[PDB]
Structures are given as structure tokens and as C-alpha cells.
Structure 1
Amino acid sequence: ALNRGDKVRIKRTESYWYGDVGTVASVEKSGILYPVIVRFDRVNYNGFSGSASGVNTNNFAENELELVQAAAK
């Protein structure tokens, strides 16, 4: 497994972040049932539909995530 900072690439298909990366803020709190909480710079800032400070941290399934950042402490 990776680390907390080890920027993984979101390869879902059914997502607004398809072909994008983010920061894996997982292996701190997401020692549970779904493994990987990642960062998103595009959380859809349309304030009267969703919000401007909504879902930046979201939990994935690793099958749809490949490693990019050598963030080993």
C-alpha cells in the first residue's frame, strides 16, 4: 500500500474527476472498510446546487487508483 501524500490517479469513468490525480489523505483516518480518501481541486463550486467547500475528501476503491508521488516519510 501507499502513504498519506502519495498522490494517486482517479481512474473511475463514472466521476467528474476522470483522468485526474489527487492527494491520498487516507492512511491516517481511512483504516476502515473503503481504503483511499483523496484530494480534489474541482469540488464543483456551484453554491446553489451543491456548495463551494463541499466534497474535497472522498473515499475510493484502490482498483480505480494508480500511484504518482514518492511521499515516503
Structure 2
Amino acid sequence: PWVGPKKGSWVKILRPESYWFQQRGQVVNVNQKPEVKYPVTVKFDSVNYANVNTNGYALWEVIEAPAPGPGEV
């Protein structure tokens, strides 16, 4: 039984200290081990100050938002 958002599905970030808070990014993969605290891996078009466009988030920090659309983060 798959857990978390599907691969390639857009999710809105709910981590307040994240550089992409309330932004959206494609789900690269979700780790299926229940022992992993932050299994969801999300990649973004906008890099942060460390020039990193991907990060691993918790299961409770992604809400499966729709596609961004024209001129929308």
C-alpha cells in the first residue's frame, strides 16, 4: 500500500522555515520505510540560497496541491 503523495504529483510545502513554504514542487520519490521521519522528496524550479532545488519533507508537510500554472509559484 503506497503511502504519501504519488510520484510526480505537485505538493504544497507546509514547512514554515522552508525556503519554499507555501510553494509547490514535484514529488521525486517517497520513502516507504515507516522508520523514516522525512520520507517525501520534493524538487523545485526555484533554488534556495544554497543553490539546492530539492529537499526531503515529512509526511505532514505536503498537501498535494494542483499544478502551478502560468506565472505562479
With the shorter chain as reference, the TM-score category is 0.5 to 0.7
* 1:37 corresponding residue in structure 2: 41
Runs of 4+ aligned residues of structure 1 deviating over 3 Å after TM superposition are: none
Give structure 1 stretches of 5+ with no counterpart: none
Match of residue 18, structure 2, among 7, 15, 18: 15
How many correspondences in the alignment? 60
The alignment-based identity, stated in percent, is: 42
For residues 53-72 of structure 1, the aligned pairs below 5 Å read 54-69=51-66
Pick the structure with more strand per residue: 2
Give structure 2 stretches of 5+ with no counterpart: 67-73
Q: Which has the higher contact order (CA 8 A, sep 6+)?
A: 1
Pick the structure with more helix per residue: 1
Larger Cα-atom Rg:
1
RMSD: 1.9
